Each structure stands twice: as structure tokens, then as C-alpha cells.
């Protein structure tokens, strides 16, 4: 697609700290950009929609290539349309925003310039952030994560995409998502099927795969940390159900691992660690600091800080694994005890280390789940299982929770706030900000 300018595109600024092993941190100035799927897609020389509701224009978009030639992405009114605001080092995303139409949540990328994404090399480094999840009920997910996206959003590889990172193109993740309207400088109209339950969405014939590091999948009830390997490390197109993931009939039939090696302390047995109020180790009614360290072995370490008190990731025992480091012994034990083979099939932490050794883009989002109601995060899943099934119970939410239309109606003022991002060598991010 090209870019159009009927609406101006001004990326909300966002600062973050780059820390050094020598013990000091220096402020960096970036900004955030909304993913292309949220945008108005229209004809290049008129206001006629190329996509509207859950359908493509059959005249502007008779095929993927003609559609991309005929159509452009336009600018976003971040606060008034999308409920996205920033202040200094803080980013807030509202759940439901009513303008001329309804908007639900957002997916945002951290930029390096107005036309390029910031890339982070995670291996050997740690990433710290503060989060307020107090306004996130059952069924919502305020996510902070990394994906192996191109810094230009795909423009150099696919010159029929001239919109680029400035307009939030080029997304990919471990689901190999097929709901994206543009992939590789082509529309996704071929094979398009409208969603049953979401007036704005559908599933196309193509998806967009890449490695994904889920630092933070969370609401006020549950949280998870999850690396996902893919056999191709960076962004790559996939065809139909060969994509696997959420948007295919067969979840596990693709090149990425859509499940990952997940670490959810509640799922692992510590049901007192994270939740609302003073009965939990971490009180989700209050802001908390989350630090994630990527040691060069390929294992992942985690600690938290709240009110000046530090807690390592709680210990878990699973089969012959015991500890609090997410390492290959953990991931192997998890597959043995909970089931599944996707993580190991895709090469495990060794394959995942190829992603963290390269550049990855920072994503912050707020979503509800039109496929599984977020039950995999915060409830019992599948819903016919009980606590007698190892790993079935992931949180205390009812198996009836998280229906998108219901939570949108009941909790429209829900929101997530991410703040005080700090990044640098392991051991460095707790030192004074600059
Ligand atoms: O695609 C939704 C969500 O899935 C997460 O994996 C789940 C999976 O959905 C479920 O079928 C299995 O039983 O459990 C795993 C781990 O909870 C995945 O980790 C997320 O990244 C993804 O957003
Ligand atoms: C949960 O984790 C916290 C922090 O490590 C610990 O203090 C507490 O004893 C744990 N509870 C259980 C049941 O494992
Ligand atoms: C729940 O339903 C699934 C269907 O996929 C089945 O595999 C499983 O055996 C069922 N579990 C129980 C405890 O009935
Ligand atoms: Co194709
Ligand atoms: Co099939
Ligand atoms: Co280690």
C-alpha cells in the first residue's frame, strides 16, 4: 500500500532509558505508531474505502496486487480515535474509545525516527518497565513484547509498500497472523473470509510469521512470560492453513510455534504470587516493575520490584525441573507435564536465541480475544478440564469470562499504562535514570 495524508500522522513521543555497564543511563527519544490494521484504507485519489466493515471493495481490490496499487493507508488521530496517549516515559492505551465509530484497543510499535522502527538486541541485555494493570479485568491483555520485524516495515523488500513503518506496516508474530490487511506490499483480499463475531475483521489467504518474545501478557489476575521460536527467524509470508496459529483451523501446522514455552506462575502452582490486593506477593492494584534478563546461554531470568521490595520469579517444580530460570530443562519438562511439542519442534531456546541475537521491535498493545476469550491466560483452558489436568488452570477467572462484546460493554474504561522503559546490559537497569 501507499500512504495518504487526508489525516495527518503525528506519532506520540515516548522516551526510554539506555543504560550502560558503567552504571549510568541516558535518555533516548522515540515515539509510537499504530499498526496499519487500525487505519482507514482508501483509494489513493478519493475518500472511497478499500476496506469497510469486514469486506474489501470488489472493484478497488479485485486481487492482492491491484488492491495495493489502488489503495493507501491514512493517518491516525491517536487520542480521539484510538485512546492512545503518552507523557514523557509513559504510554496509556484505553480499551474502548467512541468517536465517529467504536475502537477497541491498539497495537503500537516503538519508533527510532518518524519512518523507522527501533530495533533491540535482547541477548546479553535486560529490559525493565513499569506497568499499571489495575484497570485490566478478566478477558483483557495488556501486552508488551518483541517481534523480529524489519526496521522499515517491509519497504526495501516489497517496494509496492511505500507506507512503511511510518504507517505501522510489516507486522508479524508467532501466530503467523492472517487477519492483516496488507502483507509484503500486497493486500490480503484473496481468500478473505469475514469473522463471525467481529464486525471489523476477517482472515485472508496469507499470514505473516516471525519470532516473538512475549515479555508480558497480563491483566490484574494473571501474567505470563513466553518465548516463541520459528524455523525462519524474521518476517516471512505463509499460505493459508499452512500458517497455523489462531487464524487457521490447524493451530500447529505452521513454521512458528504459536504456544511458546510459557511461564505463568499461577499455572505452575503459585496462586498467591500475583493478584489484586494485599493477599498477593505482588498487588496488581498498584504499579509494579518487571525486569527480564536474556543471558547468553539462551535462558531467561525474571525479577519484579514493588514498593522497593524485590522478588525473583517464583520457584516452580515440574517433573524433574526445579528453579525459577526459564531454560531448556524447564521447557522440556513443561512439554512432558502439560503436553505439546510445538516449542521443541521449532527448535526450542536454541532457535529462539537466533531471534534475540538479532534485532527485534518493541510492541505494546491492549486487546480482547475474539477466538478464545483470553481463557488461556487467566482461566481454565480448555474449559472442560479441571485442576486434575496438569496446567489446565492458568488463573482464577470464570470459564465464562472474556466474551469481547460483554467486556467491551461492561468495562469500556479499562486501560493499561506502560512506563519507564529501561534497556541495557544485564545488571544495569536498576541504576539511576539520566
Ligand atoms: O494464541 C493465543 C495465545 O496462545 C498462547 O498459547 C496457549 C495456547 O493458546 C493454548 O492452546 C495452550 O493450551 O496454552 C498455551 C499457553 O498458555 C500463547 O502463549 C500466546 O502467545 C498467544 O497469544
Ligand atoms: C509464591 O512465590 C512467592 C515469591 O517467591 C513466595 O514467597 C511464596 O512462598 C510462593 N507461594 C507458593 C505457594 O509457592
Ligand atoms: C475435553 O475435551 C477435549 C476435546 O478436545 C478432549 O480431548 C478431552 O479429553 C476432554 N477432557 C475431559 C476431562 O473430559
Ligand atoms: Co500467495
Ligand atoms: Co484443515
Ligand atoms: Co543462567
388 Cα nearest atom in ligand 3: 13
Query: d(Cα 20, Cα 425) in Å, to the nearest integer?
Result: 6
Query: d(Cα 136, Cα 306) in Å, to the nearest integer?
Result: 18
CA proximity to 364, closest of 417, 429, 404, 288: 417
- What cell numbers appear for 4 in the block? 495518504
Residue 297 — φ and ψ, nearest 5°? Answer: -65, -20
**Strand blocks (E) in 244-372:** 274-275, 282-283, 288-294, 300-306, 309-312, 316-318, 321-323, 359-368
Query: Which residue carries 519438562 as its cell?
Result: 333
H or E segment at 378? Answer: helix 375-378
Cα separation values, 257 from 67, 83, 173, 332, Å: 31, 32, 10, 14
Q: Do residues 288 and 305 make contact, with C-beta atoms less than 8 angstroms apart?
A: yes
Question: What is the CATH T-level fold of the domain 2-434, as seen in this structure?
Answer: 1,4-Beta-D-Glucan Cellobiohydrolase I; Chain A (2.70.100)
Angle 50-51-56 from CA coordinates, rounded to 5°: 90
Determine if ligand 1 sits within 6 Å of the CB of residue 258.
yes
Query: d(Cα 160, Cα 58) in Å, to the nearest integer?
Result: 20
Residue of minimum CA distance from atom 4 in ligand 2:
314
H or E segment at 243? Answer: none
- 58 sits in the region (left: phi over 0; alpha: psi -120 to 50; else beta) called alpha
Residue of minimum CA distance from atom 6 in ligand 1:
259
- What cell numbers appear for 161 in the block? 509498500
Angle 8-13-15 from CA coordinates, rounded to 5°: 165
- What cell numbers appear for 11 in the block? 506519532
Q: Do residues 126 and 424 make contact, with C-beta atoms less than 8 angstroms apart?
A: yes
Query: d(Cα 140, Cα 131) in Å, to the nearest integer?
Result: 15
- What cell numbers appear for 351 in the block? 532457535
Q: Which residues surround ligand 5, an ion (CB under 5 A)?
A: 249
Residue of minimum CA distance from atom 12 in ligand 2:
270
- What cell numbers appear for 407 in the block? 467486556
Q: Do residues 244 and 250 make contact, with C-beta atoms less than 8 angstroms apart?
A: yes
Query: d(Cα 374, Cα 107) in Å, to the nearest integer?
Result: 17
Asked if the peptide bond before residue 313 counts as cis, ω within 30 degrees of 0, the response is no
Residue in 263, 265, 272, 274 to alter for ligand 2 test, most ligand atoms within 8 A of Cβ: 272
Using DSSP's 3-state secondary structure scheme, residue 176 falls into coil
Technique behind this structure? X-ray
- What cell numbers appear for 337 in the block? 507435564
- Could you tell me the distance, in angstroms and rounded to a whole number, from the CA of residue 254 to the centre of ligand 5? 12
- 340 sits in the region (left: phi over 0; alpha: psi -120 to 50; else beta) called left
CA proximity to 198, closest of 54, 95, 36, 376: 54
| Pair type for strands 120-121 and 125-132 | unpaired
CA proximity to 172, closest of 147, 190, 146: 147
Burial category of 26 from C-beta neighbours within 10 Å (exposed 0-12, middle 13-18, buried 19 and up): exposed
Q: Which ligand is nearest to the CA of 183?
A: 4
Query: d(Cα 256, Cα 250) in Å, to the nearest integer?
Result: 12
Query: Which residue carries 515479555 as its cell?
Result: 215
Residue in 146, 176, 259 to alter for ligand 1 test, most ligand atoms within 8 A of Cβ: 259
H or E segment at 416? Answer: strand 415-425
| Pair type for strands 202-203 and 51-52 | unpaired
- Could you tell me the distance, in angstroms and rounded to a whole number, from the CA of residue 64 to the centre of ligand 3? 40
Q: Do residues 50 and 177 make contact, with C-beta atoms less than 8 angstroms apart?
A: no
Beta bridge partners of 32: 110
Amino acid at each position: 500500500q501507499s500512504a495518504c495524508t487526508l489525516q495527518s500522522e503525528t506519532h506520540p513521543p515516548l522516551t526510554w532509558q539506555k543504560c550502560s555497564s558503567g552504571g549510568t543511563c541516558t535518555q533516548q527519544t522515540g515515539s509510537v505508531v499504530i499498526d496499519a490494521n487500525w487505519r482507514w484504507t482508501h483509494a489513493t485519489n478519493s475518500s472511497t474505502n478499500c476496506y469497510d466493515g469486514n469486506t474489501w471493495s470488489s472493484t478497488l481490490c479485485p486481487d492482492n496486487e491491484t488492491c495495493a496499487k489502488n489503495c493507501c493507508l491514512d493517518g491516525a488521530a491517536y487520542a480521539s480515535t484510538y485512546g492512545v496517549t503518552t507523557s514523557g516515559n509513559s504510554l496509556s492505551i484505553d480499551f474502548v474509545t467512541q468517536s465517529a465509530q467504536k475502537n477497541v484497543g491498539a497495537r503500537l510499535y516503538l519508533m527510532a525516527s518518524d519512518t523507522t522502527y527501533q530495533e533491540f538486541t535482547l541477548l546479553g541485555n535486560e529490559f525493565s518497565f513499569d506497568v499499571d494493570v489495575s484497570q485490566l479485568p478478566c478477558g483483557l491483555n495488556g501486552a508488551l513484547y518483541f517481534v523480529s520485524m524489519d526496521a522499515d516495515g517491509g519497504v526495501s523488500k516489497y517496494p509496492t509498500n511505500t507506507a512503511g513503518a511510518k504507517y505501522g506496516t510489516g507486522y508479524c508474530d508467532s501466530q503467523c497472523p492472517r487477519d492483516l490487511k496488507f502483507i509484503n506490499g500486497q493486500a490480503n483480499v484473496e481468500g478473505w473470509e469475514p469473522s463471525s463475531n467481529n464486525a471489523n475483521t476477517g482472515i485472508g489467504g496469507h499470514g505473516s510469521c516471525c519470532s516473538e518474545m512475549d515479555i508480558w501478557q497480563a491483566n490484574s489476575i494473571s501474567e505470563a512470560l513466553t518465548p516463541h521460536p520459528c524455523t525462519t527467524v524474521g518476517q516471512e509470508i505463509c499460505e493459508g492453513d499452512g500458517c497455523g496459529g489462531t487464524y487457521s483451523d490447524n493451530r500447529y501446522g505452521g513454521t512458528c510455534d504459536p504456544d511458546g514455552c510459557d511461564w505463568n506462575p499461577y499455572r505452575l502452582g503459585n496462586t498467591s504470587f500475583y493478584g489484586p490486593g494485599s493477599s498477593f506477593t505482588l498487588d496488581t492494584t498498584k504499579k509494579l516493575t518487571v525486569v527480564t534478563q536474556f543471558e547468553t546461554s539462551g535462558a531467561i531470568n525474571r525479577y519484579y520490584v514493588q514498593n522497593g521490595v524485590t522478588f525473583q520469579q517464583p520457584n516452580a517444580e515440574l517433573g524433574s525441573y526445579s528453579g525459577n530460570e526459564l531454560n531448556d530443562d524447564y521447557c522440556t519438562a513443561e512439554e512432558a507435564e502439560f503436553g505439546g511439542s510445538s516449542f521443541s519442534d521449532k527448535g526450542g531456546l536454541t532457535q529462539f536465541k537466533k531471534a534475540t541475537s538479532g534485532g527485534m521491535v518493541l510492541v505494546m498493545s491492549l486487546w480482547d480475544d475474539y477466538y478464545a476469550n483470553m481463557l488461556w491466560l487467566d482461566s481454565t483452558y480448555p474449559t472442560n478440564e479441571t485442576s486434575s489436568t496438569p496446567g489446565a488452570v492458568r488463573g482464577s477467572c470464570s470459564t465464562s469470562s472474556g466474551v469481547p462484546a460483554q467486556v467491551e460493554s461492561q468495562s469500556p474504561n479499562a486501560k493499561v499504562t506502560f512506563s519507564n522503559i529501561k534497556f541495557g546490559p544485564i545488571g544495569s537497569t536498576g541504576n539511576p535514570s539520566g
